[PDB]
Design an enzyme around this catalytic site. Structure first.
Site, PDB file in Angstrom:
ATOM      1  N   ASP A 292     -10.536  24.586  20.036  1.00 60.13           N
ATOM      2  CA  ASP A 292      -9.972  25.885  20.439  1.00 60.13           C
ATOM      3  C   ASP A 292      -8.782  26.275  19.553  1.00 60.13           C
ATOM      4  OD1 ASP A 292      -8.223  23.949  21.600  1.00 60.13           O
ATOM      5  OD2 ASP A 292      -8.166  24.892  23.581  1.00 60.13           O
TER       6      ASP A 292
ATOM      7  N   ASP B  37     -10.325  19.528  21.704  1.00 56.32           N
ATOM      8  CA  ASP B  37     -11.237  20.639  21.961  1.00 56.32           C
ATOM      9  C   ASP B  37     -11.039  21.607  20.786  1.00 56.32           C
ATOM     10  OD1 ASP B  37      -8.537  21.163  23.126  1.00 56.32           O
ATOM     11  OD2 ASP B  37      -9.436  20.712  25.079  1.00 56.32           O
TER      12      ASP B  37
ATOM     13  N   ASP C 261      -7.680  24.296  17.426  1.00 58.43           N
ATOM     14  CA  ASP C 261      -7.063  22.989  17.234  1.00 58.43           C
ATOM     15  C   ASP C 261      -7.142  22.699  15.757  1.00 58.43           C
ATOM     16  OD1 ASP C 261      -6.274  20.081  18.027  1.00 58.43           O
ATOM     17  OD2 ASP C 261      -7.004  20.800  19.976  1.00 58.43           O
TER      18      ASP C 261
ATOM     19  N   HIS D 157      -3.768  13.917  47.189  1.00 59.79           N
ATOM     20  CA  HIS D 157      -4.169  13.709  48.595  1.00 59.79           C
ATOM     21  C   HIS D 157      -4.240  12.286  49.192  1.00 59.79           C
ATOM     22  CE1 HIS D 157      -6.101  14.624  52.406  1.00 59.79           C
ATOM     23  NE2 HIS D 157      -7.154  13.889  52.064  1.00 59.79           N
TER      24      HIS D 157
END
Ligand SMILES: [Zn+2]
Ligand SMILES: [Zn+2]
Ligand SMILES: [Zn+2]
Ligand SMILES: [Zn+2]
Lengths: 262, 196, 115, 66, 167, 171, 49, 143, 783
Positions: free
Chosen positions: I147, I145, I149, I749
């Site tokens: 960001d 991404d 990076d 779950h």
RNA sequence: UCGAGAGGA
């Protein structure tokens, strides 16, 4: 005689009007030119003698560029790069001076009332800072207390806003068309009602409502372009619009001129 | 970054002209993307955009706050009465053509903050320089002109790719490299250095 | 720094004419014209104007990259008819349309007073 | 840090505006929303510019010069 | 448990049955239980199967888990990837560990082994019991930084004489 | 706060009343009635252990008498000041952290250490190894009560800038 | 600057067997911040008061 | 040259989550056995149940040619301003391309069309060998 | 570890990566410096001198230049200084340390590169502003991404090291992941979020805007199409104008969900000869999927053709989208007024449901489930009601919301959004649990002091009834604040654990490679396989094909495959074949139609032993359900006309082909037996597709069309064989490192199969690779 | 240099 205009209201700093028999593209291109491609004047190289103020030498240098100056006689002035002088001069540059000393024990305020032009005027309304304060001392600079000093020599040069936003004499262009949205260029997002949720515009009054029942206009074309133009003060609000048309056909005059050359 | 954890980086800058505008002639201070909010699930952000617009228009500093009985429906009522669309959405025009944008951009003054990580102090590029004193390989750190460490797994890739000759030269002249003379009988660093 | 200069956006460089005429080999009677030091500002009102002509078979502008202020412009017209003249006429018509607003408003401001 | 000259979004001059705004809420004694309505601060970007600003310069000044 | 099985008509149809799952591992004696299928009966732990049935039935049960471990989050990997590693652990004889002990004590080269985990441990056991290095291992060519027998250096190019004179 | 079962004119209410407020406000106006004056027995210091045997009332409004907006024993010993007081420093600076996802705020409770703005006022005189300041810093438009104490409205971290949730090309 | 002051580092070893410690314990209510923690390495080990 | 001539009566106007377009079902007068699925825009063209709309298909327009391995005429020319006339007399009008030739029952057939995004299905017979292949064909609607 | 297997390297660079739509798939936006700070050497050859001398005289600063000029000797002339820095004699056979240029193959690494990808050869494009520009669609193989990076490098030095990048490591080469046999990259973000809104029926693009959309394709022929209408205004269908970007000579078929060969919901997908027939574009259509256009494009057309398409789609889609626009607000996540009453009544039945069961647990009348304790059994019942509520309360707002809602649109396309993302944000958060179990009593019998002792109610046990829109309460906050921390706590270890696994695998792997006899061996010569992956195929060429034989009733197989010339009702209508009647009632030709059916039916029974699950869809080489569809498009076969060939041609043609489909050449029986054992399944599919009846009944094949198919399938299969030298085992290591990197970051779950559910992902994977005799999951299935 | 701490994604 083709494209028509009608001023709704016109002030010392703002002009509201309407545009008829105009292309949408040419309408949006008009604002684009008024924003950046409008020739102004402002500081470009701030020379420092002494600074003791709590602001960094470059904090100040920045501030100044943003201070508006009278650009009524802009065209007479030449671009610095276009000039023949070994960097700067009167025909392309307007030297200024900002001498200050915190004599008053008080918070010694600094404004446009404090900067002096040290170049030849050439008998033209240009290079004058814009004062819009009631007490007659527009645009605040910095503050000094006691032994704090600042002496400068800030230099004004031509330039358009496509180089720096400081040469932007368009404070913001209010642009609108088809408030009733008969042309249907926008899809109104609504959870309950379209009309109730969405605010009705001032420009609805000056246009015909859709009346409903009749199917959407197949041969649709955009017109009636409502506009309010705000000047900062560098240039009078009337010159702002006209120079926007002047430079635009100029930027086009260049193209054909060059076409012939090739 | 916004006060939420939406670590934004610039990837181009446009000025006023190209930038889109509301009917009032308001251009955004910056443009985000609608793709941040669902993967991050950053809801408090959308209200921070909102509540700040009312706080600016009313003049009275609007209370963001954590656990306070304030709702968006309570906010929207005060924004609807302020003339602007209560949902936040504003009809925008394409800065390029002028033609109205089908979708209405969410417009609000979200409190942003600059970070102490800038590209000019992040950047580096080395084409032969100072080598390690003991290992004779390029040094470390951008400052002392240190070369980019072609990690263990990076080698694993040039192997998988079937690049027997890329990494053959990459481990040699393209980085470290070395020339020695050894005994045929012993096969050790034992031949006395003379050459001339 | 690595970033370019702000003046580079409007100023003209070392050997790069505000226009470059080339012929599109893909389609007949078609041309590609690059606009160094230029953007949407012009291209858009050029797109809108060229469309209005009847002899224009094609008209499309493309901002190559928002990095460099150069847009290509492709124009194709009727067999025999030259596309440059289609540009020449529209270029002039735009100035005629503009000059009209320059004066209409000029008198309209004198009429309007005052605040 | 001194009233930021010209708004970042629109671009309207905000230098002279401080002295007026700072008194208006004191000499007349009224809310911000009324002061920002006056001064000609139409669009919100211009409005915030002053209201959200902090004039630290004032605190730096009380430090003896040198 | 629903099970797609062929109808006498030819077609494959959903024919459910009763399967009983546990929380214990003893096959050697549950297989011997009558009234249960001692063919379909699979234990979670493949390590028992390898000892109960045989190494090839072991590799078979090793994939089943390896596959389902990836298939869990709905992730797909082309058989040959998992059917390589699974086969890798069995192609030695018994079961091989994918850690310090299992594979780093194998027939493998001394310099190709000191690369993974045990570094000075593998360097002492090799020099004392005197061993050769194939110089065929990836890590070996990597250490030496020489033309590795990987894709590009697997084969070896020589000059041709026929088309040298010809042109 | 300390909650008590007796109320001759009512039923139950904490030992702090509308008279004590003006009493505290007077001290804040002039710059006698302090937190040390609350020696009175209106507030108590609840240890990590002492908390095991207690019953705290969340919102004193929500938790007091008989009988749209967000989802809403009667043997109370003590009462909660505000649930905002549960969060640390940088977490207080986050607006509506309740309306946000929890890890998102955890990522934000780190960005605060990366922020610019002004960390002090002296800095000009104070010689340092690496320091960052903001040209024109701005206090937030949206305020979370706790900021008034953390002096965030006095020494900010960024500016309030117009955010456009847009798809204006692919940059 | 404040956030560095109201902070609490923890050591390791001796104890910390089949226990948390990182995971936000119920007893951390009000005393310690539920969101202030440094990712990876010493996450949930260094808390902010 | 023409490749269809018929009139159809509006049966159903179906938006189906849509707005600018509507799914349309109709029945022919010449044959009750014959039916149609018509996909059609409304914004400009409104539709009402039980209406006589003179429908047509046809290929390239004109009288001369009649054309020699184009196939278009090649690309596309704008409607000029008032020069050149094809079958402009007709109301709505569209352009699309066929794909499926479904075998219904003995004599009955179903031909599938694609108007870029829009679709078309029809039944009955009498079309046979002159209906389609070349698959590219227009669409015409009158009153 | 830090000097031999991985070491610091020269001609490497690192800076922040940036997204770009106007950049190519196989491109890198090297900063205007960097390609100035790095140098490639060139020999003074007659095919560069003028460019080279100009660049040397351009020096080490004016963008394209050179820092050093190497002589015939060991001299290195440094032009940064030097005296003749501007002169330079420039003699042949001399070296030049030249500044990198546009379209210059270069290695691009996004740390940490696990798999073969994440290490592509991006052709250089030098641009201003201090950041490493990169394509948007190429964020899938790196998983980065933008960001802040930042990305690594390595500029090749020799022409041969460069040839390795150019010919083996180039970015379109790696367009298909041999990992999942499907594509590596697809359309993402704005280019995915937009295309859905563009490809539909309610979308009409007016002529003015249209003309530019056509120019934006750099491959556009110049052929203006015809508007999808006429009417008073000439409009264009988004698909019709997108079909431009899709190269003509390609046919796609999907049929998903509804799909009625004329779907009103625009379901599935139909593309014919690079033109959109019907349907909407989603993550399934464009994005990286096991048939999702790109997979067809690369395989059928080419990698360069596909790399070009990637750019085409991006620029065009993004163009309309910059002009159409997009946004999201607080309103975009607002639930309706009547829905707000109905969304709250969902918890009304739930808070009752829990209580009615709690009252059973308190009065000792609880049944208590098998194996589980009374306490365990209760908690499992109370946990079911909480999910049942929120998972339906999520559907309560989801279905309620209109399509004009951009939040729904963001999820409807794919890009960034899932059902659970709307659910928590708009409807309800749910119950937050640590170590599977709900919020346990930290204080004696109570979760918080703000709660009373033994409060097993969901409110006090960790349930968050509220939405993020409504906001949270202190209790709800601290509860999600507890369960939210645990997420990070484990995920951080989950990402540190997957690290040790990746190495363990790849190390034990290394030396493993395909040798020059399809024999997968190693450093020793220890045979792992005799045929790579039991077929000797390169994993990229393999595609999920349905084996027709295995499926259907025995009646339908006979009705579609039995060819009896002697029968009247079980023969071929002479309208299908040419010699239909001249070949009818034949006894010597029927021999083969029985023999074909012997070998054809033999398969169905053998296959049923193999895929006992009765599944027909399997990943296999050569897409035959396409080569046959290719003929009907190319050769334009009738429809009316009979087949230009006879039965003797089909049955033998199909047979003679099988012979040529070689993998191992070796003379001896065992190796020829192994080759038969290798093709086995492919022939089963081939014979299911090229059945003498089928070829004529539905297919419609001539002699020209059939002989072409036989030659196509042969070269395509021989193309499909594995490449001996392939590091197959260092490979299939990360082609397991990469899938394991994610996964566990979502896992949670559902109990009962509690052992298998917890001992999933990485927890059970430590057990597997390490191979240790520790229970965790002892559980055996009894049939 | 070397060994400890704070951050980067
Ligand atoms: Zn001179
Ligand atoms: Zn020796
Ligand atoms: Zn020596
Ligand atoms: Zn403003």
């Amino acid at each position: 005689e083709g494209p028509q205009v009608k001023i709704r209201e016109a002030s010392k700093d703002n002009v509201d009007f309407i545009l008829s028999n105009v292309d949408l593209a040419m309408a949006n291109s008009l604002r684009r030119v008024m924003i950046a491609e409008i020739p102004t004047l402002a500081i470009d190289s701030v020379e420092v003698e002494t600074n003791t103020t709590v602001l960094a030498d470059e904090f100040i240098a920045h501030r100044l560029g943003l201070i508006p100056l009278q650009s009524m006689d802009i065209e007479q002035l030449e671009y610095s790069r276009d000039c023949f002088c070994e960097d700067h001069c009167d025909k392309c540059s307007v030297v200024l001076t900002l001498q200050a000393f915190g004599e008053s024990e008080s918070t010694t305020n600094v404004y446009s009332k404090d900067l002096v032009i040290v170049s030849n005027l050439m008998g033209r309304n240009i290079g004058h800072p814009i004062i819009q304060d009631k007490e007659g001392n527009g645009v605040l600079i910095c503050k000094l207390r006691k032994g704090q000093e600042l002496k400068l020599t800030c230099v004004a040069k031509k330039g358009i806003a496509k180089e720096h936003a400081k040469w932007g004499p368009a404070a913001a262009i209010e642009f609108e068309y088809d408030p009733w949205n008969k042309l249907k260029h926008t899809d109104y997002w609504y959870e309950q009602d379209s009309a109730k949720e969405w605010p009705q515009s001032k420009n609805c009054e000056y246009e015909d409502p859709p009346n409903e029942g009749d199917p959407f206009d197949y041969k649709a074309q955009a017109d009636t372009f409502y506009m309010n133009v705000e000047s900062v003060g560098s240039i009078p609000v009337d010159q702002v619009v006209v120079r926007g048309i002047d430079t635009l056909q100029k930027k086009v005059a260049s193209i054909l001129l060059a076409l012939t050359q090739m | 970054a916004s006060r939420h954890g939406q670590k934004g980086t610039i990837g181009i800058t446009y000025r006023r002209e190209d930038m889109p505008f509301t009917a009032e002639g308001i251009v955004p201070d910056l443009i985000i993307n609608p793709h941040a909010i669902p993967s991050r699930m950053t809801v408090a952000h959308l209200i921070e955009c909102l509540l700040s617009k009312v706080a600016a228009l009313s003049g009275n500093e609007g209370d963001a706050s954590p656990f306070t009985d304030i709702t968006v429906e309570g906010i929207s009522k005060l924004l609807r009465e302020h003339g602007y669309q209560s949902r936040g959405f504003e009809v925008m025009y394409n800065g390029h053509t002028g033609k109205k944008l089908m979708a209405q951009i969410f417009f609000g003054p979200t409190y942003y903050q600059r970070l102490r990580h800038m590209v000019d102090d992040k950047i580096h590029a080395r084409a032969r320089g100072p080598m390690q004193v003991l290992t004779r390989q390029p040094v470390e750190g951008r400052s002392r002109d240190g070369g980019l460490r072609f990690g263990e797994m990076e080698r694993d890739c040039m192997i998988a790719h079937g690049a027997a000759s890329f990494l053959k030269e990459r481990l040699m002249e393209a980085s470290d490299a070395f020339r020695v003379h050894i005994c045929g009988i012993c096969g050790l660093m034992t031949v006395i250095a003379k050459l001339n | 720094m690595n970033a370019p200069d702000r003046f580079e956006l409007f100023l003209l460089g070392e050997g790069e004419s505000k226009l470059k005429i080339d012929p599109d080999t893909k389609a007949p009677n078609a041309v590609v014209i690059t606009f160094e030091k230029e953007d949407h500002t012009l291209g858009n009102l050029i797109r809108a104007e060229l469309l209005n002509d009847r002899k224009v078979l094609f008209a499309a502008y493309k901002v190559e990259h928002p990095f460099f202020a150069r847009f290509k412009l492709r124009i194709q017209t009727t067999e025999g008819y030259d596309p440059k003249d289609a540009l020449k006429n529209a270029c002039n018509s735009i100035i005629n349309k503009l000059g009209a607003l320059k004066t209409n408003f000029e008198t309209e401001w004198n009429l309007q007073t005052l605040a | 840090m001194i009233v930021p000259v010209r708004c970042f979004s629109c671009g309207k001059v905000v230098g002279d505006k401080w002295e007026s705004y700072l008194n208006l809420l004191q000499e007349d004694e009224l809310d911000e929303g009324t002061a920002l309505s006056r001064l000609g601060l139409k669009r919100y970007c211009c409005r915030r510019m002053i209201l959200t600003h902090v004039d630290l310069i004032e605190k730096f000044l009380r430090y003896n010069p040198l | 448990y629903d099970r797609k099985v062929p109808s006498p008509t030819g077609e494959y149809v959903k024919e459910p049955e009763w399967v009983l799952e546990t929380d214990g591992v003893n096959l050697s004696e549950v297989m011997t239980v009558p009234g249960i299928d001692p063919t379909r009966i699979y234990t979670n732990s493949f390590i028992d199967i390898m000892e109960v049935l045989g190494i090839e039935a072991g590799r078979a049960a090793l994939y089943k888990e390896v596959y389902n471990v990836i298939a869990s989050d709905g992730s797909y990997v082309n058989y040959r990837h998992m059917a390589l590693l699974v086969d890798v652990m069995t192609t030695q004889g018994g079961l091989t560990s994918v850690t310090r002990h299992g594979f780093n004590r194998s027939n493998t080269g001394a310099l190709m082994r000191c690369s993974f985990e045990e570094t000075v441990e593998i360097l002492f056991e090799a020099g004392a019991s005197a061993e050769l290095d194939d110089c065929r291992g990836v890590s070996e060519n990597v250490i030496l930084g020489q033309m590795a027998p990987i894709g590009t250096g697997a084969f070896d190019v020589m000059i041709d004489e026929e088309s040298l004179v010809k042109y | 706060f300390i909650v008590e079962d007796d109320e001759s004119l009512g039923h139950k209410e904490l030992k702090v009343r509308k008279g004590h407020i003006a009493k505290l406000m007077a001290t804040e106006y002039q710059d006698e009635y302090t937190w040390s004056s609350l020696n009175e027995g209106l507030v108590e210091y609840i240890d990590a252990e002492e908390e095991e045997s207690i019953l705290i009332a969340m919102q004193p409004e929500d938790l007091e008498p008989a009988e749209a907006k967000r989802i809403r024993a009667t043997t109370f010993t003590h009462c909660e000041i505000h649930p905002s007081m549960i969060l640390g420093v940088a977490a207080s600076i986050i607006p509506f952290p309740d309306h946000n996802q929890s890890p998102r705020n955890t990522y934000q409770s780190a960005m605060g250490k990366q922020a610019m703005g002004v960390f002090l006022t002296n800095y000009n005189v104070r010689m340092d190894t690496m320091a960052n300041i903001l040209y024109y810093p701005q206090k937030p438009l949206g305020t979370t009560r706790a900021m008034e104490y953390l002096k965030f409205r006095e020494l900010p971290a960024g500016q309030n800038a117009i955010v456009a949730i847009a798809c204006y090309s692919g940059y | 600057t404040l956030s560095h002051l109201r902070r609490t580092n923890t050591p390791i070893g001796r104890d910390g067997k089949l226990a948390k410690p990182r995971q936000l314990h119920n007893t951390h209510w009000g005393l310690v911040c539920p969101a202030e923690t440094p990712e990876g390495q010493a996450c949930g080990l260094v808390k902010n008061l | 040259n023409t490749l269809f001539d018929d009139i159809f009566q509006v049966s159903e106007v179906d938006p189906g989550r849509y707005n600018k377009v509507c799914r349309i079902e109709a029945a022919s007068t010449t044959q009750d056995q014959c039916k149609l699925t018509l996909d059609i825009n409304v914004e400009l063209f409104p539709v009402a149940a039980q209406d006589s709309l003179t429908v047509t298909i046809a290929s390239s327009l004109n009288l001369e040619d009649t054309a020699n391995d184009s196939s278009a005429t090649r690309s596309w020319r704008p409607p000029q301003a008032g020069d050149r006339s094809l079958a402009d007399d007709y109301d709505y009008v569209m352009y699309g391309t066929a794909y499926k030739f479904e075998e219904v029952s003995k004599d009955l057939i179903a031909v599938y069309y694609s108007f870029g995004g829009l679709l078309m299905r029809l039944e009955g017979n009498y079309r046979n060998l002159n209906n389609l292949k070349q698959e590219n064909a227009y669409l015409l609607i009158r009153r | 570890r830090g000097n031999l297997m991985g070491k610091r390297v020269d001609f490497s660079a690192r800076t922040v990566i940036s997204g770009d739509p106007n950049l190519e798939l196989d491109q890198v936006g090297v900063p205007k410096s960097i390609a100035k700070t790095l140098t490639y050497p060139e020999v003074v050859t007659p095919y560069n001198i003028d460019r080279l001398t100009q660049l040397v005289r351009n020096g080490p600063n004016e963008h394209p230049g050179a820092k050093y000029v190497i002589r015939d000797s060991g001299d290195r002339i440094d032009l940064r200084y030097s005296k003749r820095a501007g002169d330079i004699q420039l003699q042949y056979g001399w070296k030049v340390e030249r500044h990198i240029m546009d379209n210059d193959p270069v290695l691009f690494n996004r740390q940490p590169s696990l798999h073969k990808m994440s290490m592509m050869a991006h052709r250089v494009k030098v641009i201003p502003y201090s950041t490493f520009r990169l394509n948007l669609s190429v964020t899938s193989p790196y998983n980065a991404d933008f960001d802040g990076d930042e990305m690594n490098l390595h500029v090749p030095q020799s022409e041969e090291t460069r040839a390795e990048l150019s010919q083996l490591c180039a970015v379109p080469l790696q367009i298909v992941s041999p990992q999942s046999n499907k594509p590596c990259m697809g359309i993402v973000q704005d280019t995915l979020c937009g295309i859905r809104k563009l490809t539909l029926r309610d979308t009409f693009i007016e002529l003015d805007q249209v003309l530019n959309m056509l120019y934006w394709v750099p491959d556009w022929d110049g052929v203006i199409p015809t508007p999808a209408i006429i009417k008073p205004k000439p409009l264009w269908s988004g698909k019709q104008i997108l079909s431009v970007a899709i190269p003509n000579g390609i046919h796609l078929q999907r049929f998903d969900e509804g799909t009625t060969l004329l779907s009103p919901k625009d379901n599935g997908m139909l593309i014919i000869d690079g033109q959109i027939i019907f349907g909407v574009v989603e993550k399934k259509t464009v994005g990286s999927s096991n048939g999702g256009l790109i997979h067809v494009v690369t395989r059928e057309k080419g990698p360069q053709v596909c790399a070009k398409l990637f750019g085409n789609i991006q620029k065009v889609v993004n163009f309309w989208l910059l002009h159409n626009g997009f946004s999201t607000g607080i309103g975009d996540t607002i639930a309706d007024g009547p829905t707000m009453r109905e969304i709250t009544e969902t918890i009304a039945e739930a808070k009752k449901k829990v209580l009615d069961v709690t009252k059973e647990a308190q009065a000792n009348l609880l049944t208590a489930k098998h194996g589980m304790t009374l306490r365990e059994s209760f908690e499992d019942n109370v946990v079911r009601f909480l999910n049942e509520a929120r998972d339906k309360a999520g559907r309560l707002a989801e279905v309620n919301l209109k399509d004009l809602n951009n939040v729904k649109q963001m999820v409807m396309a794919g890009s960034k959004g899932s059902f659970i993302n709307i659910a928590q944000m708009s409807a309800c958060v749910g119950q937050q649990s640590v170590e599977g179990k709900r919020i346990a009593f930290g204080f004696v019998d109570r979760t918080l002091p703000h709660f009373s002792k033994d409060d097993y109610s969901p409110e006090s046990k960790g349930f968050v009834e509220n939405s993020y829109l409504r906001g949270l309460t202190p209790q709800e906050f601290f509860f999600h604040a507890m369960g939210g921390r645990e997420g990070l706590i484990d995920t951080a270890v989950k990402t540190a654990e997957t690290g040790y696994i990746q190495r363990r695998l790849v190390k034990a792997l290394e030396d493993i490679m395909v040798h020059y006899d399809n024999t997968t061996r190693n450093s020793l010569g220890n045979v792992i396989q005799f045929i790579y992956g039991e077929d000797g195929m390169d994993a990229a060429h393999i595609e999920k094909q349905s084996l027709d034989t295995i499926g259907g009733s025995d009646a339908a197989f006979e009705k579609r495959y039995r060819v009896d010339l002697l029968n009247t009702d079980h023969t071929l209508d002479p309208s299908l074949l040419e010699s239909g009647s001249e070949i009818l009632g034949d006894l010597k030709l029927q021999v083969l139609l029985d023999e074909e059916y012997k070998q054809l039916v033999k398969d169905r029974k053998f296959l049923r032993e193999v895929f006992v699950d009765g599944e027909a869809n399997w990943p296999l080489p050569v897409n035959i359900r396409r080569i046959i569809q290719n003929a009907q498009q190319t050769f334009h076969i009738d429809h009316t006309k009979p087949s230009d060939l006879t039965i003797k041609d089909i049955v033998l043609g199909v047979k003679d082909l099988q012979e040529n489909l070689l993998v191992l050449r070796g003379k001896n029986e065992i190796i020829q037996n192994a080759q038969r054992d290798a093709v086995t399944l492919f022939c089963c599919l081939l014979r299911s597709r090229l059945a003498t009846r089928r070829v004529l009944q539905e297919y419609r094949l001539t002699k020209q069309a059939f002989d072409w198919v036989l030659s196509n399938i042969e070269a395509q299969f021989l193309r499909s064989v594995v490449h001996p030298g392939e590091m197959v085992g260092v490979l299939a290591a990360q082609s397991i490192g990469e899938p394991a990197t994610q996964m566990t970051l979502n896992t949670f779950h559902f109990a009962g199969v509690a052992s298998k559910k917890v001992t999933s992902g990485v927890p059970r994977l430590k057990e597997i690779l390490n191979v240790a005799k520790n229970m965790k999951t002892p559980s055996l299935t009894v049939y």
